[PDB]
């Protein structure tokens, strides 16, 4: 219950590995994800060394309480991980092979600027604090790093689960702290977003555009203002249920542009009727005819400008 | 305590069984279900064998801490199960009869493509990790796999609770792992979905179709656009309260088709009026008369095409 | 720390009592209810019998760890109850009088077919598993069963808290198990249901019926379709916040019937106008006049048919 | 680990005091409030009396396990309080001075009949169960009962925190139980309820009243029915997010009355038009002119009747 | 397991420091924030002093159970913090250097009067209660007060994390209590507020203003009342999801003013039509022409008055 002594003035190397068993509950609002995995740890504690001849065993098993185990913590976790030690195996040279199953709700920022065509890199930061008698440094054993094939996140494609092999060693509260970065790369499954969100939202806008093939101000006011109600009602229906993104998103710019188009279409309908009343039906009919091409063309062009700006 | 020694070079067989006491909280959004059940374990440990004559007992009881018990874990759980050891009984031959009551929130994918006429197979994966001293293999005693008659999930018919007898034995982090798949087959209770969701949604669409028996553009604009608002408002009312399904569902296709029909009906109403105002009432009246049959026929046929594609 | 020995071959009778301190959080969506109560247990253990003369005490008090206590569990709970042992008293004959205060979230199905005039019977199932050396059977001490007068559930009248005195004894995992049924009968007290949900919903329907005293198709389309929107919007306002009931409810049938009446009223308004435009105002006016009586009469009769079917 | 012996046949007096550190999460729907506070207990145990000369200490400190401490519980809590013993000090006469910090979710009924001008008295009931060898009675020293100045509940004015000095001593399951009543008096901050809820709700009603200064049935139908939609939509916006109150509230009566006024205004608009079309414009214009005064006067009077009935 | 003895009659100084690791879950509705941090404590205990020559070590490490550690608690926490002792180091002079990693959901009031241009000061109040044999006072080690550079709150700019070096010493429950205030200053990221909430809300108001360039009462009623519906529907879309603020906010005043403008615009539309129908088109046209300037000017001025009043 004290760290192993150094042979010379070298730090203790704790080789790590994370193997994803299950990944679940990716919360976009909270920017958190719950993960269930193995955490394999390996280090040399020469005090535990033995002769397999005298012992009559080629490997010894210990209880966590019986031996020194490094305090590995996660940097970006809500509460400490719920861990269960699966196995502890000591070889005759004193090499400890530790294995545990943990479940953790990890906090990792998400960038929704390119939503719903966005990709994310989920982080899991391992950390070890160095002690009084010696310094502890983390390492990655790539043979011990991977993910179960059945690992899934509904609406996401799990690209890869890797680790940045080089640790970040730094001083914190007068002690060395070695930090490791485990990355889970995911890309969104945006298929049903076209028929369920985009297409019906465009149909409602297109219905407002039929006021350019009508001279009735009463029918035109009912067209543009009722489609604005239908649009707002449709936005409540497809609402993300997360608090509004403080920054401007791709989908957010399109929806803002759609609100601008309902305002510009009201301005046209109001101008058309005012010119018709103010004995100028030549200008009223020429504006309404221009709008039939101007509205879809300006819309198509502005969407290409946004798509270019965001991608 | 170490694992029991093999008589020959055979692995240790741990006979399992799960008996569902209560099933609750089936979350469609989270794809998780909370279960409370018994987990029975049986294996032979010859070290624990005794003579009932010398001992004066026909069965011995032990505390979990006193004897070797295999570490059985569940693969698809959020956090480790909340377990309470109910009984441990050792017979003179060394047979250990273990029993525990546990509660766990199990993660099981759900396929909503055929919703609300869908059936689901909920999984509970048992797993045991082998040690270096000896290999551990799981077995299913099907007489031990069951469920309480009073077990229920509102809106579902619990068909069966089974296990696939053959375990999935595989290597993971240089050790053998025996995995058992327990299945809970459930089928949805879609009764009230016709009168509460389908019938009122179709009525709103049918009201938009009365514009084919009217020449008033003002009454037709109020018909088709107000029914679109009534439809969107009705969708908000019958909203699933789960984030949108990343894949296209049966119900999702129908609702997309309904949005298309409101757009096509606006196009007709706009064409009818434009042909009437552009001195062509022969073409305007012939289109409106055709729509009276074309709309219900194309709808009925497209539904048959979707029903055929999904089932 | 062994069960008491039988005098003859009789099972151990554990007399139970439950005294409701507080009842709260009745969740209709989850079909669960939280309860805070006393659980009294009484059984005879002749090993604990004493002479009050030699001991100098008429009653002995023990710590739970000092004596044998039967493991009583609840069948229909989410997780095990939060229990705290209040008192353990042993009389000179060996009668143990155990008392504990517990809190538990009990799962009990709810039938909403007669909502909001429904009554429910909430269950709490006690169970004891028999042990190696002897069988354990539950009994009810009616003097120890009851509820605090201040116990309440907002929107419900707590009729009674009783128990089914005869236990359900059966075999489970090769051991006898004795089960007790504790019933809490509650009836809904929703006075405000009529003025807050029914009356405004009927007013919206009655407003659609004013189209029978109007010949204006434009005013009639605005009447029936805007009231349909107002109805749907009112249903969103009075939405139960629980996922839709898989079976058809009383309130559910009325609301379905109301949606049918909005569709039938559109059919009338469409027929009236088509007969008027197709040079038949004799038939148009006779239908509109008939509807003034037919609609309220068919509605009143259909409601009596539903009320008769559900009650 | 036995109660202190009486000098004469007197019960043990346990002096209590609750000091509110933080008050949070007042849930109107659940009728529960989460409180964090100190619980001070004082009682005399002559067995713990000592001579400060021989001991060489003026005060002795003990661990809770070392001495007898009365089992104090709260009656109206969800689960037992989360407690942490802060200090235990024994003076030479045997006086025990116990202090603990606890958090607890207290269940206390709320009366919303006068909402949002309502005041509430939140209760906390301390209770002690008497034992075999002696009776235990609670006492309160109001000098010890208080609250932190920074204690807050958003939207409420915490008037006072007190205790009813006289305990309720009663028999429960053949033992005496002494109960104390702590009371937290709070009154609502209804400031923004006039400009955010009442004022916009009245404006929507007043817009429906402009139909009394119009003869156009088409404009009157659009006025009265669209304001009914705007009212229902506004009620969804200002919805309390708690299930509807089973009893009739003040705000509930006003809103019911507002729904009645939209129905009566439709009846007027329908009568006006029917009298006009049935060659009686003398009666139609006289009703519409009467309504201009009748509607605001009947509204103003009915509100005074409700305000008088509720306050 | 006794506090250290004073050299003279001085109180024990416990030097504190908090180092923010992660900040998450800032709940505006609950006025709580979850934080993960280090808590460093330093105090002198001469009983633990040693000669480094005879002992032969830099610092002596202890288990929390082995030495006296001051009970530091947080004032404004829901439940006690989840703490993990990271390290305890004693230097030759008797200086104890304690370190722990904790997670806590801190309660801190939020002032939304200037929302969404508001800044908040989040508090974490440390407190120590003085003991029998000596008084304990808190201090701040400015070298140990800090925050990780990667600390974030989505939609907020974390300005600073400082501590009020001077503690608040006061009597509580007959004992001295030293309290420290740790402040986390945050300012909101209101960027997407303008295009996502302000601009579409103003467009809906501007559409109602087109009724000043129209004489049609039917088109004007449809303009002002349908935009009121669109506004209310847009408010439901951008609803804060927190229960209503009891005090009047900046955004709250603007939205109240917008509801007043819809009522005043209805009054104009009603007056215009009544003057027109009552043979006075000179006054009707002069009011409608005045409103074209009066409405945007009064709006712009009233907004400047509110902006001045709130900032
Ligand atoms: C309420 C329906 C509405 C106003 C906007 Se739709 C909604 N909500 C209306 O009242 N009058 C119309 O002529 N058309 C409409 O669609
Ligand atoms: C014009 C009718 C608009 C209907 C508004 C419905 C508001 C839905 C609120 C849903 C909360 C999840
Ligand atoms: Cl951790
Ligand atoms: Cl598990
Ligand atoms: Cl239980
Ligand atoms: Cl308690
Ligand atoms: Cl704390
Ligand atoms: Na064991
Ligand atoms: Na026991
Ligand atoms: Na004690
Ligand atoms: Na200690």
Nearest ligand, measured from the Cα of E83: 7
Distance from CA of D95 to the nearest CA of E (A): 15
Cα D298 to Cα D205: distance, rounded to the nearest angstrom: 14
3-state SS track over D289-301: HHHHHHHHHHHHH
- Would you call C87 and D32 a contact, using CB atoms and an 8 Å cutoff? no
Distance of alpha carbon B71 from alpha carbon B79, whole angstroms: 15
What is the rounded CA–CA span in Å between residue E274 and residue E281?
Answer: 9
H, E, C per residue of B154-204 = CCEEEEEEEEEEEEEEEEECCEEEEEEEEEEEEEECCCCHHHHHHHHHHHH
Distance in angstroms (rounded) separating the CA atoms of residues B190 and B248 = 19
How many A×E Cβ pairs under 8 Å? Answer: 134
**Contact state of B73 with A101 under an 8 Å Cβ cutoff:** yes
Kindly list the protein residues whose Cβ atom lies closer than 6 A to any atom of ligand 2: A 229, 233, 236; B 229, 233, 236; C 229, 233, 236; D 229, 233, 236; E 229, 233, 236
Using CA atoms, how far apart are residues A106 and A224, in angstroms rounded to an integer? 46
CA-based radius of gyration for chain E: 31
Separation CA E243–CA E252 (nearest Å): 13
Between D226, D256, D267, which is nearest C196 by CB? D256
Dihedral of alpha carbons A62, A65, A68, A70, sign: positive
| Listed residue (E64, E61, E69) closest to E85, CA to CA | E64
Q: Measured between alpha carbons, how far is residue B112 from residues A230, B33, D48 in Å?
A: 27, 16, 69
**Closest by Cα among E195, E183, E197, E243 to E27:** E243
Q: Using the beta-carbon criterion (under 8 Å), do C192 and D76 form an inter-chain contact? A: no
- Chain E: residue nearest A229 by CA? E230
Q: Which two tokens stand for residue A124?
A: 């899991």
Task: State in Å: Cα C103 to ligand 5 middle.
Answer: 9
Residue C77 Cα, ligand 5 centroid: separation in angstroms? 7
> Which of C233, C238, C241, C243 most suits a substitution to test ligand 2, by most atoms within 8 Å of the C-beta?
C233
Q: Which of D40, D89, D229 sits opposite E229 (nearest CB)?
A: D229
Nearest residue to A117 (alpha-carbon basis) of A79, A155, A88, A74: A155
User: Mutate which of C32, C191, C207, C285 to disrupt the D interface (most D C-beta within 10 Å)?
Assistant: C207
CA distance D286 to chain E (A): 16
Dist. CA C154–CA C149, nearest whole Å: 14
SS3 readout for A144-173 = HCEECCCCCECCEEEEEEEEEEEEEEEEEC
D309 Cβ neighbours under 8 A, 6+ residues apart: none
- Phi and psi torsions of E53, nearest 5°: -70, -60
Question: What letter would DSSP give residue A48?
Answer: G
- CB D229 within 8 Å of CB C230: yes
DSSP letter (8 states) at residue A4: P
Residues E261 and E302: beta-carbon distance below 8 Å: no
State whether the Cα torsion A254-A260-A264-A269 is positive or negative: positive
User: What b/e string do you get for A165-185 counting C-beta neighbours within 10 Å, with b at 16 or more?
Assistant: eebebeebbebbbbbbbbebe
CA distances for E209 relative to A218, A242, A278, E206, angstroms: 16, 33, 19, 5
Rounded to whole angstroms, the Cα distance separating E165 from E145 reads 11
d(CA D197, CA D264): 23
Cβ contact A259–E203 (<8 Å)? yes
Query: Do residues B94 and B46 lie in contact, with contact meaning Cβ atoms separated by under 8 Å?
Result: yes
Chain B contact probe: residue of C27, C218, C225 with most B CBs at under 10 A: C225
Measure CA C34 to chain center: 12
CA distance B219 to chain C (A): 5
User: How many angstroms separate the CA atoms of C17 and C38, rounded?
Assistant: 8
**Distance between CA C203 and CA E93 in Å, rounded?**
84
Residues composing chain B = 311
Name which of D93, D184, D83, D72 is nearest D138 in CA terms. Answer: D72
* Residue D277: closest C-alpha in chain C: C214
Cα–Cα distance measured from residue C192 to residue D244, given in angstroms and rounded to the nearest whole number: 8
Provide, as residue numbers in chain C, all residues whose Cβ is less than 8 Å from the Cβ of D244.
190, 192-193, 196-197, 238
Ligand 1 neighbours by CB, cut-off 6 Å: A 222, 226, 229; B 222, 225-226, 229; C 222, 226, 229; D 222, 226, 229; E 222, 226, 229
Measured from the alpha carbon of residue D102, the closest ligand is: 6
Taking contacts as CB-CB distances below 8 angstroms, the residues of chain C near D236 are: 233, 236-237
DSSP-assigned beta bridge partners for residue D120: D186
Q: How far is CA C113 from CA C31, C122, D101, in A?
A: 14, 16, 47
CA end-to-end span of chain A? 55
- Provide φ and ψ at E266, rounded to 5°: -70, -45
Residue C287 · residue C271 · CB < 8 Å: yes
In this structure, the strands spanning B12-16 and B136-140 are parallel
Q: Which residues surround ligand 4, an ion (CB under 5 A)?
A: B 73-74, 77, 80-81
Beta carbons of B191 and C246 less than 8 Å apart: yes
Length of chain D: 311
- For D40, D41, E106, E111, the CA distances from D18, given in Å and listed in that order, are 7, 9, 22, 29
3-class SS at B239? coil
| SS3 per-residue string spanning chain C | CCCCCCCCCCCEEEEEEEEEEEEEEEECCCCEEEEEEEEEEEEECHHHCCCHHHHCCCCEECCCCCCCCCCEEECCECCCCEEEEEEEEECCCCEEEEEEEEEEEEECCCCCCCCCCCEEEEEEEEEEECECCECEEEEECHHHCEECCCCCCCCEEEEEEEEEEEEEEEEECCEEEEEEEEEEEEEECCCCHHHHHHHHHHHHHHHHHHHHHCCCHHHHHHHHHHHHHHHHHHHHHCCCCCCCCCCCCHHHHHHHHHHHHHHHHHHHHHHHHHHHHCCCHHHHHHHHHHHHHHHHHHHHHHHHHHHHHHC
Q: Do C103 and D228 count as a contact with CB atoms less than 8 A apart?
A: no
Question: How far is the C-alpha of A15 from the C-alpha of E201, rounded, in Å?
Answer: 57
Do the Cβ atoms of C87 and D217 come within 8 Å? Answer: no
Neighbours of E160 (CB within 10 A): 10
| Residue E62 alpha carbon to ligand 3 centre in Å | 22
Pocket test of ligand 2: the residue of E222, E225, E228, E236 to mutate, having most ligand atoms within 8 Å of its CB, is E236
Q: Mind telling me how many Å the CA of A2 is from chain B's nearest CA? A: 25
Q: E95: distance to nearest CA of chain D, Å?
A: 25
- CA neighbours within 13 Å on the CB side: how many for B203? 26
Which of D22, D144, D219 lies nearest to residue E217, judging by beta carbons?
A: D219
Sign of CA dihedral C263, C264, C270, C273: negative
Both tokens assigned to B92: 């003179």
Which of A236, A238, A239, A241 is the pocket-test mutation for ligand 2 (most atoms within 8 Å of CB)? A236
Of A22, A219, A222, which has the smallest distance from its Cβ to B107's Cβ? Answer: A22
How far is residue D223's CA from residue E217's CA, in Å, rounded to a whole number? 11
Which of E38, E59, E37, E40 has its CA nearest to residue E48? Answer: E59
Q: Cβ separation of C214 and D218 shorter than 8 Å?
A: no
From the CA of B104, which ligand is nearest?
4
Residues within 5 A (CB) of ion ligand 10: D 69
To 10 degrees, the CA torsion angle through E249, E253, E255, E257?
180
Per-position DSSP letters for D141-196, written without gaps between them = -TTT-EE-TT---TTEEEEEEEEEEEEEEEEETTEEEEEEEEEEEEEE--TTHIII
Tokens (6 digits) for A276: 């018709």
Q: Which ligand is nearest to the CA of A78?
A: 3
Rounded distance, CA D211 to CA D266, Å?
10
d(CA A210, CA A288): 11
Question: How far from C8 is each of B59, C4, C12, C134, CA to CA, in Å?
Answer: 21, 12, 11, 11
Task: Report the gap between the CA of E59 and the closest CA in chain D (Å).
Answer: 30
Closest CA to D161 of D183, D137, D193, D135: D183
Q: Note whether A169 and A144 are within 8 A (CB).
A: no
Neighbours of chain C (3+ CB pairs under 8 A): B, D
Facing residue for B236 by CB, picked from C236, C267, C270: C236
* Residue D83 main-chain phi, psi, to 5 deg: -110, 150
The backbone torsions φ and ψ at residue C227, rounded to the nearest 5 degrees and listed phi first, read: -70, -30
From the CA of D70, the nearest ligand is 10
Residues of A whose CB is below 8 A from B71: 86
Contact status, residue E17 vs residue E140, Cβ threshold 8 Å: yes
- E177 vs E130: CA distance, rounded Å: 6
Whether residue B244 and residue A192 make contact (CB cut-off 8 A), yes or no, is: yes
Interface touch D203/E262, C-beta < 8 Å: yes
What is the SS3 assignment for A126?
A: strand
- The strand order across the sheet containing B156-172 reads B72-74, B119-129, B175-188, B156-172
CA B4 to ligand 8 center in whole angstroms: 12
For residue E152, give the nearest of A81, A123, A76 by alpha carbon.
A76
Please tell me the distance from the alpha carbon of residue C45 to that of residue C93, in angstroms, as a whole number.
8
**Closest by alpha carbon to A71, among A184, A175, A182?**
A175
Packing angle between helix D199-208 and helix E217-237, nearest 10 degrees? 160
Cβ burial of E306 (10 Å; 0-12, 13-18, 19+) is: middle
Q: How far apart, in whole angstroms, are the C-alpha atoms of residue A211 and residue A225? A: 11
Chain E partners within 8 Å of A131 (Cβ): 61, 87
Q: Which domains does chain C possess?
A: 1-192 (2.70.170.10), 193-311 (1.20.58.390)
Q: How far is E124 from chain D (nearest CA, A)?
A: 13
CA gap D160, D178 in Å, rounded: 24
Q: What is the DSSP string of B67-93?
A: S----EEESSBSS--EEEEEEEEE-TT
The residues, ordered by sequence, that sit 6+ positions from E252 with a Cβ below 8 Å of its Cβ are D192, D195, D196, E245
């Amino acid at each position: 219950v004290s760290p192993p002594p150094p042979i010379a003035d070298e730090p203790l190397t704790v080789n790590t590995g994370i193997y994803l068993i299950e990944s679940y509950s990716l919360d976009d609002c909270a920017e958190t994800f719950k993960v269930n995995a193995f955490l394999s740890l390996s280090w040399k504690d020469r005090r535990l060394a033995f002769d397999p001849v005298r012992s009559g065993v080629r490997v010894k098993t210990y209880e966590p309480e019986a031996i020194w185990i490094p305090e590995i913590r996660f940097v970006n976790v809500e509460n400490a991980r719920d861990a269960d030690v699966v196995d502890i195996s000591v070889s005759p040279d004193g090499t400890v092979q530790y294995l545990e199953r943990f479940s953790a709700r990890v906090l990792s920022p998400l960038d929704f600027r390119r939503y719903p065509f966005d990709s994310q890199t989920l982080h899991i930061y391992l950390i070890v604090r160095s002690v009084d008698t010696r310094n502890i440094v983390l390492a990655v054993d790539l043979e011990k790093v991977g993910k179960n094939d059945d690992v899934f996140l509904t609406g996401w494609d799990i690209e890869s689960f890797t680790a940045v092999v080089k640790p970040a060693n730094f001083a914190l509260e007068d002690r060395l702290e070695s930090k490791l970065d485990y990355q889970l790369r995911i890309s969104r499954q945006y298929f049903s977003y076209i028929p369920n969100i985009i297409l019906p939202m465009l149909f409602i806008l297109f219905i407002s555009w039929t006021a350019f093939w009508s001279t009735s101000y009463e029918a035109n006011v009912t067209l543009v203002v009722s489609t604005l109600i239908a649009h707002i009602a449709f936005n409540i229906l497809v609402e993300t249920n997360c608090p509004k993104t403080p920054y401007m998103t791709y989908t957010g710019a399109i929806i803002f542009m759609i609100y601008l188009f309902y305002f510009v279409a009201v301005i046209e309908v109001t101008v058309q009727h005012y010119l018709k009343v103010e004995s100028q039906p030549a200008r009223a009919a020429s504006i309404t005819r221009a709008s039939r091409i101007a509205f879809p063309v300006v819309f198509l062009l502005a969407n290409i400008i946004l798509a270019f700006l965001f991608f």
